[PDB]
Amino acid sequence: ATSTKKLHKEPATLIKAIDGDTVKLMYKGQPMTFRLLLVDTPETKHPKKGVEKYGPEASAFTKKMVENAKKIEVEFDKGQRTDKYGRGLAYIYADGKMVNEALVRQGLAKVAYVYKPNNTHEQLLRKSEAQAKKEKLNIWSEDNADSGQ
């Protein structure tokens, strides 16, 4: 595949995360929001009696992986760069780990709708989503017995 790859990663710092998909990071010497591309997080405000499933989970792993990951790199996809709300459409890499591939392989986020041309790390997100569903992690842990009946 190519000789030395055609995509690189720029250095960025942490500023202030808000949700599991919305995270503010310092890039280009300026405060810019970043929305995990091809990623989707569950709402934690729908319920007023407190989330009993997984409300405060992706948000805690987002601020914990970004606050600890000293090497945070960002990689914009050849697709657009900013959504219509000024969101940084790209992928995050905490400690050389695809933050998006982590929340998805952990069973705390599903692959967001796929819209071309944004489709680079798509098949990869499909494999991680299948693993979480194959391990019954968090949301994928609904099977009770399914042994005959």
Q: How far is the C-alpha of 87 from the C-alpha of 81, rounded, in Å?
A: 8
Q: Is 81 a catalytic residue?
A: no
Phi first, then psi: give them for residue 130, nearest 5 degrees: -70, -35
Say whether 67 is catalytic.
Answer: no
DSSP 87: -
3-state secondary structure of 81: coil
- Residues listed for the chain: 149
CATH number at residue 66: 2.40.50.90
User: Nearest to residue 110, comparing CAs of 132, 87, 83, 92?
Assistant: 132
What the block records as the tokens of 23 is: 């995270």
Distance CA 39, CA 111 (A): 5
What's the CA gap between 122 and 138, in Å, rounded? 22
Query: Do 66 and 94 contact (CB within 8 A), yes or no?
Result: yes
Binding residues: 21, 40-41
DSSP for 31-61? EEEEEETT-B---SSS-SS--SSSSSSHHHH
Please state, in angstroms and rounded to a whole number, the distance separating the CA atoms of residues 54 and 104.
14
Residue 111 is given by DSSP the state -
Query: Which of 35, 57, 101, 129 is labelled catalytic?
Result: 35
The one catalytic residue in 73, 87, 126, 129 is 87
Is the N-terminal amide bond of 117 cis, ω within 30° of 0?
yes
Fill in the DSSP letter of residue 51: -
Q: Among residues 10, 43, 67, 122, which one is catalytic?
A: 43
Alpha-carbon torsion (6, 14, 67, 50), positive or negative: negative
Domain of 88, in residue numbers: 1-149
Q: How many domains, the chain? A: 1
Binding site members for Ca(2+) = 21, 40-41
